[PDB]
Ligand binder design. Structure first.
Ligand SMILES: *Cc1cc2c(cc1C)nc1c(=O)[nH]c(=O)nc-1n2C[C@H](O)[C@H](O)[C@H](O)COP(=O)(O)OP(=O)(O)OC[C@H]1O[C@@H](n2cnc3c(N)ncnc32)[C@H](O)[C@@H]1O
Ligand code: HEM
Ligand SMILES: CC1=C(C(=O)Nc2ccccc2)SCCO1
Ligand SMILES: O=C([O-])[C@H](O)C=C([O-])O
Ligand code: SF4
Ligand code: F3S
Ligand code: FES
Ligand code: NA
Lengths: 588, 122, 238, 105
């Protein structure tokens, strides 16, 4: 070894909600743990979460986790693993109450209990009356959650490597993941983080698009690292476009706006969601609401102005008091990025890339999965994944609002609780050779040695425009085929991209160049998968295949990196505590 | 070793910050001023001759200016000092607006006392 | 229209000392972008320009900068609020902290003070709740204006007291956090926390300079919080 | 401790504010300052006590105040302790000199 080796029981790549909850549990279980993050932990995208955490506490009204499971299963359009969803909704309450005991500043009901607001895809009695089970701290829940978790990691004395950048996973000759190489952003030092368990918690990748609600740091590094390591990704074509991103800015305004009583209007002042979704109205599934808005615009009923084509989100009727109390966050966002005061005027909104439903296939234990030559599932020894980088899958083809933060906590904790048994199950892993570690640096070495190559900025903007045009809310065969070919060309330009900053002391250019590789891998996997699934399910909508096909496509899509081809995995439909919810027609 | 940005000339300072740094300065000056006031007092009380001598010193224009400065610095320290104690006891709000407003009022009150100090010295 | 910048530059492997570099950026005449928008575009022409950023919506607290002499967030500071006919838009790092590279400062000491006040719920365990701790809306409202802190360090890096004793004075942000737990009805170690804040530096280095309040991007008021802490210290140790 | 200083500074601040009002009151209402009216004012038991009380208050006020300034701008230990020695001695000298001046009036 001519490279510093830092050995730990577990190496958690990512300090978001999922990463910090996992690190917390792993440490308390008696194992050493290194928490990596390319930004200061509290700068993670989780910090921007607004709405809250969907969980069946039963505070606002008598609730049932089975009701929550139903809403989730239906919401995922029936490709969400029901055994995993069952675990999440059942375990939810305890896991969330645990956060409150950590000091999380939840909003409060008059009786002192945690405040719960209505949200999209929430009903009582299995598809009945509207429900309200999204626990929230105003509309800064993500902020409250993340900081509380960081505070808990401080109290726990967790070993945190802040502003370190994971490059690539390290594999031994047996094909097992035995850690990863990382770049210290401050000094430029490259180190091999050796571990018996490498937990990917790197978040989403909304930045593969021209317009997204995601932070600049959401570049899908986890997806890229997985793909380059031979690990398959799942349901990458399932991209959730949040109905209400600020038109012309992309900045998100919480679905809590509609959960508190706000509704959408077109240029004619019609509350059009009553037409598209007679029952749930403005609180229908996000995939449905997003399309409804785009149909209004596409047919000339959308509003225009400085912000560009959009729909109006009316909130003023709620009153100054309720707005400033329950939704102060969106008041500042709207006034700042839209120059609109929600207390007096509707907010200009338009569907914006928001959440990645796809990712690395995992068991409830967090263990990463791949498939053998027979198509059978086999665990990837040493590799794990939690959060938005994972595809459990508990969200299927459409995630419910508030289910992500729940996902982070429940499965981040799950990975921690079952880490010891997972490590014993996988057995001792053979040491990585000096060439094994060296292979993980090939991608870094290329940048460092490329001076006269192409301008990466042009490559990034071309990539984002391709995804925006050909893989947005509405898709079609012809457009996706061309988008795929364009990506192949763009991917070739990237192989000869240049790094104009060669310094080592906090060189952000090198970081963003390395991130670009991951944007490419994520974008390509998404494209190939989109073309693959010839049907319309959840957020995936094709004009050439407008119907949902339960005979041919009641399953997950799987992108195989080594053959750059597609295959399929079974959707789990065998809950342990109740019968499975059978696939039926999905309307709101 | 690493450099730090602490070039005071490149930084904005609100009226509250100016008022604060002046209160510290006025405090230091008053510390030296006490000794000078005591030295003067001791002379004016030792004998009938010492008093006339003290009067003559107060006649000097250069001494008149300095004496005015001492009284001005003292006046400021007292007024702004009370401003402080009024916030400590809740008589003044601790908002930025209240901070500005009380600071400006402190300056005005000080200017008035500075003039009355001038009258007392002519 | 044309925009002119004067930006703080430093690279330990190249620069003998810090320096200011002139930047020009053609902007859309009838479009008002944020400072962060400009910085990102400047990096497109000069890839060597280093600075922190992430959420670009004023929540994460990554891009705290000294703009035209005053601290704030680049992501929510409009170019129109900085642009003055004849003068360059001056961009410098947050004052007081060691400069790692260009506009990036070492927040070590800032985090250190944050940890010193033990920023985590301390509940003795007695009288445990059936489910979640019961906190009335009245009690919960005491946390408003305190828990919203994004740890951007705009306040502390503008406080002279923090400049002179960054290792002893907790600073605006840290003290805001301390009070955040001091008045949390769920925290049971109020007396213990106060006993660790009775020295001459921790809290009493604050002299109501009020640089903290004016710069806070979230509109928080560290001065009032510190004021409350002082009262509690008196009620207990006077 | 921090709380102790905070209180002492305000305690003496209140005393010295009253003393200044007292001293200003006289100056602003006495006309011609003849050597006679001057010595009569400082011969009063009330003036003597109030003045010495003020000097003690200045000692406490100034010492705490100057200590805060030094601990801010003067880092070198040796240099700071020496400056604190000079300052403290001077303050004590003020009070003592005050006793000698008034006791012989
Ligand atoms: C964008 C968004 C999402 C969101 C939301 C509002 C916005 C604007 N509001 C939500 C809500 O109200 N309720 C809810 O359930 N979800 C909401 N979301 C979605 C949700 O917040 C996110 O999906 C969730 O926060 C994801 O958390 P996760 O922990 O999985 O990902 P992260 O928070 O972004 O953290 C990722 C960490 O990984 C580190 N990282 C990334 N790359 C590297 C490398 N290469 N090396 C080392 N570390 C790396 C990042 O630093 C980050 O800390
Ligand atoms: C008479 C001689 C006096 C001297 C030599 C003196 C000197 C000082 C000094 C050096 C400080 C420290 C300021 C700092 O650290 O920035 C101070 C503080 C203070 N002084 Fe005085 N002072 C005197 C009288 C008074 C009087 C008459 C008042 C009337 C209100 C007063 C009110 C205060 C207050 C309230 C503070 C606290 C400053 C703070 O907390 O920021 N002082 N003094
Ligand atoms: C630290 C402190 C002051 C100070 O250092 N102010 C200051 C110094 C330099 C530049 C501006 C303000 S004035 C009030 C007492 O405490
Ligand atoms: O709209 C929100 O507040 C946010 O979008 C919530 C989730 O869960 O994604
Ligand atoms: S108090 Fe305000 S300025 Fe200070 S760290 Fe918190 S958010 Fe930033
Ligand atoms: S600027 Fe500093 S002095 Fe106190 S009022 Fe704010 S912490
Ligand atoms: S970028 Fe997150 S606060 Fe400015
Ligand atoms: Na996912």
């Amino acid at each position: 070894m001519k490279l510093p080796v830092r050995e730990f029981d577990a190496v958690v790549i990512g300090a978001g909600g999922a990463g910090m909850r996992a690190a917390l549990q792993i440490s308390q279980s008696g194992q050493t743990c290194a928490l990596l993050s390319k930004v200061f932990p509290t700068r993670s995208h989780t910090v921007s979460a607004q709405g809250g955490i969907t969980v069946a506490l039963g505070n606002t009204h008598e609730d049932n986790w089975e009701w929550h499971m139903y809403d989730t299963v239906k919401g995922s359009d029936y490709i969400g693993d029901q055994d995993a969803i069952e675990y999440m909704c059942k375990t939810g309450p305890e896991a969330i109450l645990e956060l409150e005991h950590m000091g999380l500043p939840f909003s409060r009901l008059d009786d002192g209990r945690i405040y719960q607001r209505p949200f999209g895809g929430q009903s009582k009695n299995f598809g009945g009356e509207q429900a309200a089970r999204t626990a929230a701290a105003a509309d800064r829940t993500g902020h409250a959650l993340l900081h509380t978790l960081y505070q808990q990691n401080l109290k726990n004395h967790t070993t945190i490597f802040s502003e370190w950048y994971a490059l690539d996973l390290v594999k031994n000759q047996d094909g097992a993941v035995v850690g990863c190489t990382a770049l210290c952003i401050e000094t430029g030092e490259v180190v091999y983080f050796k571990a018996r368990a490498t937990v990917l918690a790197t978040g989403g990748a909304g930045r593969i698009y021209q317009s997204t609600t995601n932070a600049h740091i959401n570049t899908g590094d986890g997806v890229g690292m997985a793909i380059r390591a031979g690990v398959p990704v799942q349901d990458m074509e399932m991209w959730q476009f949040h109905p209400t991103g600020i038109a012309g800015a992309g900045v998100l305004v919480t679905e809590g706006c509609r959960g508190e009583g706000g509704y959408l209007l077109n240029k004619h002042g019609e509350r059009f969601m009553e037409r598209y979704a007679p029952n749930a109205k403005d609180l229908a599934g996000r995939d449905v609401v997003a399309r409804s808005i785009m149909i209004e615009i596409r047919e000339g009923r959308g509003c225009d102005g400085p912000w560009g084509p959009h729909a109006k989100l009316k909130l003023d009727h709620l009153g100054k008091e309720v707005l400033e109390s329950r939704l102060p966050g969106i008041l500042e966002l709207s006034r700042t990025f839209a120059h609109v005061d929600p207390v007096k005027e509707p907010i200009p909104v338009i569907p914006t890339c928001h959440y990645m439903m796809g990712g690395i296939p995992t068991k409830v234990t967090g263990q990463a999965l791949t498939v053998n030559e027979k198509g059978e599932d086999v665990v990837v020894p040493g590799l794990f994944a939690v959060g938005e980088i994972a595809c459990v899958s508990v969200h299927g083809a459409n995630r419910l609002g508030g289910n992500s933060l729940l996902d982070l906590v429940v499965f981040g904790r799950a990975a921690g609780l079952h880490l010891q048994e997972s490590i014993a199950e996988q057995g001792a892993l053979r040491d990585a050779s000096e060439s094994d570690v060296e292979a993980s640096l090939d991608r870094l070495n290329r940048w460092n040695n490329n001076r006269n190559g192409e301008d990466p900025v042009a490559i990034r903007k071309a990539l984002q425009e391709c995804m925006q045009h050909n893989f947005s809310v509405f898709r079609e065969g012809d457009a996706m085929a061309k988008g795929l070919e364009q990506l192949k060309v763009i991917r070739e330009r990237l192989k000869n991209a240049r790094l104009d900053d060669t310094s080592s002391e906090f060189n952000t250019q090198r970081v963003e160049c390395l991130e670009l590789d991951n944007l490419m891998e994520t974008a390509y996997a998404t494209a190939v998968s989109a073309n693959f699934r010839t049907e319309s399910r959840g957020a995936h909508s094709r004009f050439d295949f407008p119907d949902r096909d339960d005979e041919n496509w009641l399953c997950h899509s799987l992108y195989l990196p080594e053959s750059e081809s597609m295959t399929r995995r079974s959707v789990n439909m065998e809950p342990k505590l109740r019968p499975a919810f059978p696939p039926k027609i999905r309307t709101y | 070793q690493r450099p730090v940005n602490l070039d005071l000339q490149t930084i904005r300072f609100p009226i509250t910050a100016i008022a604060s740094i002046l209160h510290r300065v006025s405090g230091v000056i008053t510390f030296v001023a006490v000794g000078i006031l005591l030295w003067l007092l001791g002379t004016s009380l030792s004998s009938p001759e010492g008093f006339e001598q003290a009067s003559a010193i107060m006649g000097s224009f250069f001494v008149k200016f300095i004496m005015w400065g001492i009284l001005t610095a003292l006046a400021y320290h007292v007024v702004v000092g009370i401003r402080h104690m009024m916030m400590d006891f809740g008589y003044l709000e601790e908002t930025f607006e209240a901070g500005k407003r009380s600071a400006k009022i402190s300056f005005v009150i000080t200017v008035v006392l500075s003039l009355l100090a001038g009258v007392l010295v002519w | 229209m044309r925009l002119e910048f004067s930006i703080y530059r430093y690279n330990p492997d190249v620069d003998d000392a810090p320096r200011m570099q002139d930047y020009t950026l053609e902007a859309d005449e009838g479009r008002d972008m944020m400072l962060l928008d400009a910085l990102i575009q400047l990096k497109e022409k000069d890839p060597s320009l280093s600075f922190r950023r992430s959420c670009r919506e004023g929540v994460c607290g990554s891009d705290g900068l000294n703009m035209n002499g005053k601290n704030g967030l680049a992501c929510i500071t409009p170019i129109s609020a900085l642009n003055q006919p004849g003068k360059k838009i001056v961009i410098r790092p947050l004052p007081g902290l060691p400069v790692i590279r260009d506009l990036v400062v070492d927040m070590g000491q800032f985090y250190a003070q944050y940890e010193k006040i033990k920023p985590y719920l301390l509940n003795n365990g007695q009288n445990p709740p059936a489910r979640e701790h019961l906190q009335m809306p009245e009690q919960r409202e005491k946390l408003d204006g305190l828990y919203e802190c994004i740890l951007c360090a705009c306040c502390s890096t503008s406080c002279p007291s923090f400049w002179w004793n960054p290792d002893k004075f907790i600073g605006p942000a840290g003290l805001l956090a301390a009070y955040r737990f001091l008045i949390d009805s769920r925290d049971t170690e109020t007396d213990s926390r106060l006993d660790g804040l009775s020295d001459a530096f921790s809290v009493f280095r604050c002299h109501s300079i009020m640089n903290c309040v004016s710069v806070c991007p979230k509109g928080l008021n560290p001065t009032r919080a510190i004021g409350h802490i002082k009262s509690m210290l008196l009620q207990r140790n006077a | 401790n921090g709380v102790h200083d905070f209180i002492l500074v305000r305690a003496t601040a209140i005393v010295l504010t009253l003393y200044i009002i007292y001293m200003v009151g006289f100056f602003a209402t006495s006309g011609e300052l003849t050597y006679e009216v001057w010595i009569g004012f400082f011969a009063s038991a009330f003036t003597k006590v109030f003045t010495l009380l003020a000097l003690f208050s200045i000692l406490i006020m100034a010492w705490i105040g100057m200590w805060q300034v030094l601990t801010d701008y003067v880092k070198p230990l040796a240099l700071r302790l020496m400056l604190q020695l000079v300052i403290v001695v001077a303050l004590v000298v003020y009070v003592i000199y005050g006793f000698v001046v008034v006791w012989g009036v």
